[PDB]
Amino acid sequence: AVVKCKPTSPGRRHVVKVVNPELHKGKPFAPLLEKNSKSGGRNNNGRITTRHIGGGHKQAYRIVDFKRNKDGIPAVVERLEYDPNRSANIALVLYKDGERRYILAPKGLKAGDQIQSGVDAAIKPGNTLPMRNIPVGSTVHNVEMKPGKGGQLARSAGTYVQIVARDGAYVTLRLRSGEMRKVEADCRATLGEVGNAEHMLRVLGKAGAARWRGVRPTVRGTAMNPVDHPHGGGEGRNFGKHPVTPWGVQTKGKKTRSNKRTDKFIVRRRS
Amino acid sequence: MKRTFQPSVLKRNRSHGFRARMATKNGRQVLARRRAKGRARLTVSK
RNA sequence: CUUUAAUGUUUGAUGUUCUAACGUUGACCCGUAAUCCGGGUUGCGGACAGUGUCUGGUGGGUAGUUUGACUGGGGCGGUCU
RNA sequence: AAUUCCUUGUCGGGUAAGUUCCGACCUGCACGAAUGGCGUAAUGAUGGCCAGGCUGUCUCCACCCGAGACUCAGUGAAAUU
RNA sequence: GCUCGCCGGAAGACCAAGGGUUCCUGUCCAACGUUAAUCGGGGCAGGGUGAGUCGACCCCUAAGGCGAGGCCGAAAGGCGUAGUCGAUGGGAAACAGGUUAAUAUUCCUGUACUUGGUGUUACUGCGAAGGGGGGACGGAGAAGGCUAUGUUGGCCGGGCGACGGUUGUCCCGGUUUAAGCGUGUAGGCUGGUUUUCCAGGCAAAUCCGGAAAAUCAAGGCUGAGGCGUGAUGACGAGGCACUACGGUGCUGAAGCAACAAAUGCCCUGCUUCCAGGAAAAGCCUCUAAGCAUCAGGUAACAUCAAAUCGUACCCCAAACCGACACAGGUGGUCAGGUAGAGAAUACCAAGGCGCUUGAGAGAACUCGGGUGAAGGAACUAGGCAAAAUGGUGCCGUAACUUCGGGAGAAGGCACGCUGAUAUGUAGGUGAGGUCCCUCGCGGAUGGAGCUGAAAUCAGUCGAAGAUACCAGCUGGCUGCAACUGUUUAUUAAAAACACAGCACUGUGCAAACACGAAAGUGGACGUAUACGGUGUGACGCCUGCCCGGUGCCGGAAGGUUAAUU
RNA sequence: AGGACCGAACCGACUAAUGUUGAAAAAUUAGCGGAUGACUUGUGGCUGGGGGUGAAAGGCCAAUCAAACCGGGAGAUAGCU
RNA sequence: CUUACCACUUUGUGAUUCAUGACUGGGGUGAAGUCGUAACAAGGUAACCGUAGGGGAACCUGCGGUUGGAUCA
Ligand SMILES: NC[C@@H]1O[C@H](O[C@H]2[C@@H](O)[C@H](O[C@@H]3[C@@H](O)[C@H](N)C[C@H](N)[C@H]3O[C@H]3O[C@H](CO)[C@@H](O)[C@H](O)[C@H]3N)O[C@@H]2CO)[C@H](N)[C@@H](O)[C@@H]1O
Ligand SMILES: [Mg+2]
Ligand SMILES: [Mg+2]
Ligand SMILES: [Mg+2]
Ligand SMILES: [Mg+2]
Ligand SMILES: [Mg+2]
Ligand SMILES: [Mg+2]
Ligand SMILES: [Mg+2]
Ligand SMILES: [Mg+2]
Ligand SMILES: [Mg+2]
Ligand SMILES: [Mg+2]
Ligand SMILES: [Mg+2]
Ligand SMILES: [Mg+2]
Ligand SMILES: [Mg+2]
Ligand SMILES: [Mg+2]
Ligand SMILES: [Mg+2]
Ligand SMILES: [Mg+2]
Ligand SMILES: [Mg+2]
Ligand SMILES: [Mg+2]
Ligand SMILES: [Mg+2]
Ligand SMILES: [Mg+2]
Ligand SMILES: [Mg+2]
Ligand SMILES: [Mg+2]
Ligand SMILES: [Mg+2]
Ligand SMILES: [Mg+2]
Ligand SMILES: [Mg+2]
Ligand SMILES: [Mg+2]
Ligand SMILES: [Mg+2]
Ligand SMILES: [Mg+2]
Ligand SMILES: [Mg+2]
Ligand SMILES: [Mg+2]
Ligand SMILES: [Mg+2]
Ligand SMILES: [Mg+2]
Ligand SMILES: [Mg+2]
Ligand SMILES: [Mg+2]
Ligand SMILES: [Mg+2]
Ligand SMILES: [Mg+2]
Ligand SMILES: [Mg+2]
Ligand SMILES: [Mg+2]
Ligand SMILES: [Mg+2]
């Protein structure tokens, strides 16, 4: 549930949490974690590459496995876990083979359910399957860029992709961004919508939230001096300039998108 | 108040020590520089 | 032979199809009880993308500078032959 | 009005008397809707105005206890010129 | 040497960093101490820091660094695989007395402990750079139990008192004692065991993971402290004998109980929460190749080994950082008594000190304060500064409001001491006795003794009883900004920045973008409910009309147009 | 529970006085703000100069900052004193 | 003498009530001023109710509903 927050104190009167009590309360499956080490958006030379980034909590990475091989062998969702690395809600599984793994955990992820993955598998949320098999117009789930690459689409929470159509070896699908993309079809993609979905409700409230969440504050352009940002200048706010990135680039126009090595797998751009 | 010099043998060395000195191109030059000028203590010996 | 049309032939304009350069931050094998690298296999893409030379555009992101004198202080205004 | 030049605009409130303050009028030199408009409980070592208590802040200073100030002995500077 | 005064969550004690002989003794006083100086952190000498167990090496790794080959780059070099380094973190073991002028978990006494090699004996599958487990990890809060330790009584030693009284209900003091060994308790966690089967843990595995049955359940880990042993020992007030007067030898009483406690321990626990909480080795186990009467493995005990550096002293300071023997800066540890909510505070203990110029005098004036008739903000840019207020409980408390607040609003009342209730109550604590028993650090029932608040009465002294220190001033109107926060180190803390929220816009992942000539890397081990950029800046009601100009998005048919040919 | 309340340590720095050849190249004293958090601190590490970093003041980058310090080009140039 | 109860009276802070106030909201009356003509006929776009937005103003427009609508629809 979302649940608001009593105006018990300032910077808490707005807070809008999001509790999914069905999430494991103990620690994670240790043998599937591995450090993390904050980066602070720094480069290999210590030079800050991406601004606003640092602090936050410890954050230990899980394992996930957006590949989903282990075919034919079924498994029952052991539990449901909370994941810091992603927005979605990771979920254990344990195959009948005796091996335990993680999964983003889609819509219907009731603890105890079963799931498979393979040319045969079964059209059902949880079961991974190569689009070459799954029906057309399905909600799908974690799509896979290249064949067997590992899946990198609709991974965030509440995300999903619609298999608009297929034409031979390629399958034209619709990304959540609203773009008409194409894929090798021979790419696993599982089924069902990614869990949570109600994630886009968190209000946070107090600044701290974002801060201890691993996000530093942001400095506006028309706030600093010229020598520091194209949006410099002072003596009374002012501006009389074109909205540009700290490097002189219309942050309201352009597009930057210059690949030409991918347009091929693109029909209708994000609108 | 707090001055501008907080000593730390460990750091003092690995910062301007003959070792970290003989670690860079222009480093071994810094030495040779003195070695030529006949410096007493090359670089914070002990 | 000229004014002009089918055949071959040549060469440009695009448009497809192909693989064999070229890419792959897909999947394996080996070097190797390695995540880099290299070779091999296969799949995908494919003369495209990319790069080099030349070239039109854009380009305070950056850089070198200019931005006059008279003037009953200077500026403003006016003046300079 | 943190925007009003004329400006102490005018009127009302507070005063014994108010170029500040509060409430109004609109003749807005030169407010105005995310270089946001108007509000807004709580918050503030924030700006302005008022009051009670308080008092040497003041009328108008007086006394008192100490550290220098002065005398002695030892050491013994400075700027400037 | 006797007084006096100051610090005492320190101005004490120990330690890291840093210093580097400043330590100690004996000497010397030129220069160095802001004075004198016989004195010193000064000069000159010697003397002085003794470890298997403390630490550093040393194993293990974090950040990050380095980096064979390798990939890049005019050169120099950049980057990075294997791997190797790198603590601020993980791995094994010593305590208590004594002693030196100065050393001390190092030397002496006593009582222990760890690990490795070699040997004797008993038993046995041993075997990794490998698999698994374990190490091994967050915030906050909520108890209970325990110790530290204090208080009081007992006990023992001493004391009968410069002035009224003080041999019995009296004053002073002490009342200590560790590692280790046994016990395994308050309490915490978890069901065990056998057999069978298997697409997992890169090979294998008896280990782990999974599936079956079968069978018992009182099993198995863990863990403060207590109690014994340590220890008829030590220490111990105190005497007796000696002194160079610093300090010596010998001898030695009691040495228990109750209650009260911790921020320490049980507690890497328990509850709960979202921001979801190092790594690796040691360690336990499993097998691999190998071995295959062997070697090894396990336990007992005997023995040898445990190297090498550090160890003086300062360490909130006159030994460090500040040019000074400078009112500044400096991380960790310990935490007594009275009163108190308490590491505030006040007075004190152990402990340490009086700050390296002093003697007088008692002028204006400056500095820091105490008190002021009457008035009470007339001061002044301005109530600047002062003065005031201050506690616990109870009564009671407005507009407004986001229903939390505003609110300790405001404004009041009671507070000392003595007796009774009650010879000390309510509570806390919990000894015999007694009961039984799985069974003993057992359970029950007993409620002695110990400790002990508040209240209500009546009385009583002062001007005053939150008497000191300490310890909100309050209210009303209004601009700005939601609020905590942040900022011009050294004139600006704000109306500035930032923020939660909002909107626009870019980005399909080898993302956009950014660092980089490149290789590579961050973004992100993220993937549009995501990441970047910009502007606004909670929340409420909203957010109009203009696309002519500039930019940006879409079109490109046509006109103009580069290299080239 | 809380970027919750009062208040030490601890972090900070709003006011005044004193100092201004200071005890001190920013402190002392009496008040003052935050004090479970965007908290505070030890130890070590990574960002290097037109570059870094910056809850943005042109602030910090060793008492130095509208381009650090050191050495060199270098006896830069100086219609000026 | 003293204590208790209590009158006058004192203080602080709310509640209610009437008066009043720079200005201002709309409402009532007023022979003959301006601007338009919304409604009553199909009132010349049928009218009205609720509601929302817009506008010098009656009003207009959108959504749903009613007939208390005219025609031989
Ligand atoms: N007072 C009545 C209310 O207000 C309005 O009515 C008011 C006005 O509209 C109306 O004013 C009218 C004006 O409309 C019309 N075009 C001209 C006429 N002379 C005016 O009349 C008004 O002013 C004049 C002065 O000369 C007076 O004499 C007359 O009494 C007065 N009614 O007179 C009323 C003032 O009394 C509403 N129409 C009415 O429905 C409502 O109930
Ligand atoms: Mg600014
Ligand atoms: Mg610029
Ligand atoms: Mg400026
Ligand atoms: Mg320029
Ligand atoms: Mg030049
Ligand atoms: Mg006004
Ligand atoms: Mg607008
Ligand atoms: Mg006044
Ligand atoms: Mg003299
Ligand atoms: Mg010496
Ligand atoms: Mg000495
Ligand atoms: Mg000496
Ligand atoms: Mg490297
Ligand atoms: Mg190592
Ligand atoms: Mg360490
Ligand atoms: Mg007597
Ligand atoms: Mg010592
Ligand atoms: Mg000593
Ligand atoms: Mg001194
Ligand atoms: Mg007076
Ligand atoms: Mg006045
Ligand atoms: Mg004041
Ligand atoms: Mg005062
Ligand atoms: Mg104003
Ligand atoms: Mg603010
Ligand atoms: Mg603040
Ligand atoms: Mg300043
Ligand atoms: Mg300031
Ligand atoms: Mg703004
Ligand atoms: Mg604003
Ligand atoms: Mg707080
Ligand atoms: Mg102070
Ligand atoms: Mg506080
Ligand atoms: Mg540091
Ligand atoms: Mg500086
Ligand atoms: Mg030259
Ligand atoms: Mg010169
Ligand atoms: Mg009409
Ligand atoms: Mg209608």
Side-chain angles (χ1 to χ4, degrees), chain A residues 63-77:
Chain A
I63 280 304
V64 193
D65 145 50
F66 320 78
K67 285 286 194 58
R68 293 285 275 120
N69 295 314
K70 206 107 161 161
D71 281 35
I73 322 301
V76 293
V77 283

Side-chain angles (χ1 to χ4, degrees), chain A residues 4-21:
Chain A
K4 233 290 257 294
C5 293
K6 280 283 196 59
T8 176
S9 56
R12 222 280 161 138
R13 82 178 311 135
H14 291 83
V15 184
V16 175
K17 304 148 75 176
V18 56
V19 292
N20 207 342

Side-chain angles (χ1 to χ4, degrees), chain A residues 9-85:
Chain A
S9 56
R12 222 280 161 138
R13 82 178 311 135
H14 291 83
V15 184
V16 175
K17 304 148 75 176
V18 56
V19 292
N20 207 342
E22 62 174 317
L23 279 39
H24 182 43
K25 283 199 191 300
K27 298 138 62 183
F29 188 54
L32 281 192
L33 324 167
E34 57 165 74
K35 238 280 205 61
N36 214 318
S37 335
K38 307 306 288 173
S39 57
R42 261 65 169 191
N43 189 190
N44 330 316
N45 357 294
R47 305 279 224 65
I48 296 181
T49 312
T50 291
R51 315 160 60 164
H52 338 134
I53 187 133
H57 205 331
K58 205 59 176 304
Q59 270 199 188
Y61 189 89
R62 280 79 246 274
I63 280 304
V64 193
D65 145 50
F66 320 78
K67 285 286 194 58
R68 293 285 275 120
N69 295 314
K70 206 107 161 161
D71 281 35
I73 322 301
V76 293
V77 283
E78 280 231 21
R79 71 172 73 155
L80 272 181
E81 275 184 51
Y82 165 96
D83 184 302
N85 319 83

Side-chain angles (χ1 to χ4, degrees), chain A residues 180-229:
Chain A
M180 242 40 130
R181 231 273 186 183
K182 280 212 178 285
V183 72
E184 274 214 42
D186 289 287
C187 321
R188 332 184 76 59
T190 89
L191 264 145
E193 307 170 50
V194 44
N196 239 40
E198 50 192 355
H199 168 71
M200 65 179 295
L201 264 297
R202 272 153 74 274
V203 107
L204 296 96
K206 67 198 277 190
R211 247 308 248 284
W212 64 42
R213 187 160 264 99
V215 177
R216 298 282 306 294
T218 299
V219 183
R220 304 139 52 216
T222 186
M224 26 180 138
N225 280 53
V227 315
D228 287 315
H229 186 311

Side-chain angles (χ1 to χ4, degrees), chain A residues 150-264:
Chain A
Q152 307 125 75
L153 306 188
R155 252 130 122 298
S156 167
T159 66
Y160 64 69
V161 184
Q162 293 185 65
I163 307 295
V164 183
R166 86 157 50 200
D167 272 49
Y170 285 155
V171 164
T172 139
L173 77 198
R174 188 160 54 200
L175 309 156
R176 228 285 170 175
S177 75
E179 183 175 293
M180 242 40 130
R181 231 273 186 183
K182 280 212 178 285
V183 72
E184 274 214 42
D186 289 287
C187 321
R188 332 184 76 59
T190 89
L191 264 145
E193 307 170 50
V194 44
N196 239 40
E198 50 192 355
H199 168 71
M200 65 179 295
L201 264 297
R202 272 153 74 274
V203 107
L204 296 96
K206 67 198 277 190
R211 247 308 248 284
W212 64 42
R213 187 160 264 99
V215 177
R216 298 282 306 294
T218 299
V219 183
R220 304 139 52 216
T222 186
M224 26 180 138
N225 280 53
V227 315
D228 287 315
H229 186 311
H231 273 195
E235 225 54 30
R237 300 278 164 67
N238 287 25
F239 198 134
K241 296 185 294 207
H242 278 98
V244 301
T245 91
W247 297 269
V249 227
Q250 9 282 89
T251 330
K252 255 57 179 185
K254 287 296 184 63
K255 243 149 176 168
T256 83
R257 195 242 140 66
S258 185
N259 194 302
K260 214 172 293 174
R261 185 202 88 216
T262 58
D263 301 26
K264 150 67 184 181

Side-chain angles (χ1 to χ4, degrees), chain A residues 260-271:
Chain A
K260 214 172 293 174
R261 185 202 88 216
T262 58
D263 301 26
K264 150 67 184 181
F265 320 78
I266 268 187
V267 182
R268 197 245 294 298
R269 282 219 73 183
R270 170 215 60 271
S271 291

Side-chain angles (χ1 to χ4, degrees), chain A residues 77 79-81 89-93 101-106 109:
Chain A
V77 283
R79 71 172 73 155
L80 272 181
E81 275 184 51
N89 249 164
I90 240 310
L92 200 47
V93 65
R101 265 187 216 171
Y102 271 135
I103 294 172
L104 266 55
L109 70 203

